[PDB]
Design a protein around this ligand. Sequence first.
Ligand SMILES: CCn1c(=O)c(-c2cc(NC(=O)Nc3ccccc3)c(F)cc2Cl)cc2cnc(NC)cc21
Length: 306
Amino acid sequence: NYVYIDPTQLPYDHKWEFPRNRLSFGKTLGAGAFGKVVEATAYGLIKSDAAMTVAVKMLKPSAHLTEREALMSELKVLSYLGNHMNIVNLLGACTIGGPTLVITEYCCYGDLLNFLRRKRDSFICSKTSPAIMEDDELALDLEDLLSFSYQVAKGMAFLASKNCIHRDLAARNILLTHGRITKICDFGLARDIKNDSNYVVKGNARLPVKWMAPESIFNCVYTFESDVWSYGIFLWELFSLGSSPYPGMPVDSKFYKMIKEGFRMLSPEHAPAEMYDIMKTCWDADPLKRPTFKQIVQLIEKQISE
Ligand SMILES: CCn1c(=O)c(-c2cc(NC(=O)Nc3ccccc3)c(F)cc2Cl)cc2cnc(NC)cc21
């Protein structure tokens, strides 16, 4: 019982406008064929006597009208959503006197997938041999993984409450910032998907097939519940410390058949049983039997308090 809004029709509130001459650009954080995101310093963005680090999304010279619309749509979507602790927050925009710039908080630890991949030595396998440890104030533990699961569920519950479907939920699209706070991000204009093997050609499009619900892959259906499927795959990435899902399996005819047949990933070693149970419910072939994000938050709350 929903229709899709054309995001180009959403309003842009001019309260966001910031002068471009108050930005100083630094290193590139991500880039695609037509766009990029740079770290920058903004002068007097929030308080007139303070400078702060921000991220800025912009187009490259190679961009056309569709990309110009795509960037303005990102601005309009964030303006619509408003702030939440667990999504990238809009801080301002430069829409006059030069190329469109969209300014958000800068997430200082980068994407969660790469972060998990460099924290693998915080964990060990279930074995019975003696182990030696080294002190490391920046280690991760199981409580951190549970916190990341909870924070991403709250961010997704927020999006669902605003009638928003993210459509590319994955550890690579979740950022980490000060306080180990996770922020769901739109990586549009910030990745060249043609060179990311996680995006597979299926017909006309390059799609993150290992993260996608069967109704999305096979029927081009996208709902709140298809995002829940992807959240289940994200949990698997989380408790597997950044393993690629379906490890060792290419996306081919066999993969598609096995998904339809009901095959699912097995529990990661470091997943609590209750967390694997959640993943399994997120992967029900019937979208109506998957939990909602509001339900997931309620469940993870129960286990975090116990
Ligand atoms: C390169 C990836 N990246 C980004 O794309 C963005 C970013 C995201 C959106 N848009 C959104 O994130 N929108 C959105 C988020 C959640 C749900 C729906 C829309 C936007 F308009 C403008 C920017 Cl600059 C911020 C960012 C901050 N710090 C980073 N640290 C490495 C990386 C970052």
